[PDB]
Design a protein around this ligand. Structure first.
Ligand SMILES: [Mg+2]
Length: 259
């Protein structure tokens, strides 16, 4: 019996839902209260009766604020996660810095009075959009204990991610002209270790800014990935292996079976 399983058995509809089975509450971390990042919003399940939850930190991209990623916070948290959407120290911070700030945001959750008793501090993940996705890769590349990483239209000057030991879902936008997949997302997938649990999901017809408003394909497979690897929840492998056949996906490849 997997002690980290939360919520009822999933369906495609349940992972597409704008809100999952867990009611969510939120608390704000001010910039003055945030050591090593720019503040943020923490979304968490109020129901404690099934146990503690894994934690996820999400970074926006260059010049962007929390607003651009906020919709991910409650949508993911309501599936059974404590999720912090961050602001960065400055709007101009580059990817390695954003990765360090993602780690700082996770470290913050460990002692946050509102959520300390709701998180399993051993089970943590990182996500981000654009330079924030490069940040998520960098955070994993500097911390092999992270359980999942999800760069969304990630941008980074570093193309070699052989240091990453964290299961990673690389989400590309087919028509991205800012972080084009051929030189960013797909290059990242290809240099992640060949034996890592990993996947590349390309969003058909999508531009760079697909992640800045609700996108059901992004949410449903981000949720499945976090469930599968932050919770070791084998009930979600069905959505990842074999490749999704959604029309909204133009390309997909993975190191399935994860088991
Ligand atoms: Mg289908």
């Amino acid at each position: 019996a997997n002690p980290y399983e939360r919520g009822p058995d999933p369906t495609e509809s349940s992972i597409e839902a704008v809100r999952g089975p867990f009611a969510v509450a939120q608390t704000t971390v001010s910039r003055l209260q945030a050591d090593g990042f720019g503040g943020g919003t923490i979304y968490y399940p109020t129901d404690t009766s099934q146990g503690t939850f894994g934690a996820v930190a999400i970074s926006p991209g260059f010049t962007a604020g929390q607003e651009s990623i906020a919709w991910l916070g409650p949508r993911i948290a309501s599936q059974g996660f404590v999720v912090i959407t961050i602001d960065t120290i400055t709007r101009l911070d580059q990817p390695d810095s954003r990765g360090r700030q993602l780690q700082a945001a996770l470290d913050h959750l460990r002692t946050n009075s509102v959520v300390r008793n709701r998180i399993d501090p051993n089970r943590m993940a990182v996500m981000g959009h654009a330079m924030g996705g490069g940040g998520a890769l960098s955070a994993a590349a500097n911390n092999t204990s992270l359980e999942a990483a999800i760069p969304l239209q990630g941008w980074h000057t570093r193309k070699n991610w052989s240091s990453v030991r964290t299961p990673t879902l690389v989400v590309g936008a087919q028509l991205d002209t800012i972080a084009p997949v051929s030189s960013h997302s797909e290059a990242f997938y290809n240099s992640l270790p060949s034996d890592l649990d990993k996947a590349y999901m390309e969003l058909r017809g999508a531009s760079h800014l697909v992640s800045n408003t609700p996108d059901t394909t992004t949410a449903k497979y981000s949720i499945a990935w976090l469930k599968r690897f932050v919770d070791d929840d084998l009930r979600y492998e069905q959505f990842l292996c074999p490749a999704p056949d959604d029309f909204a996906i133009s390309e997909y490849r993975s190191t399935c079976p994860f088991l």
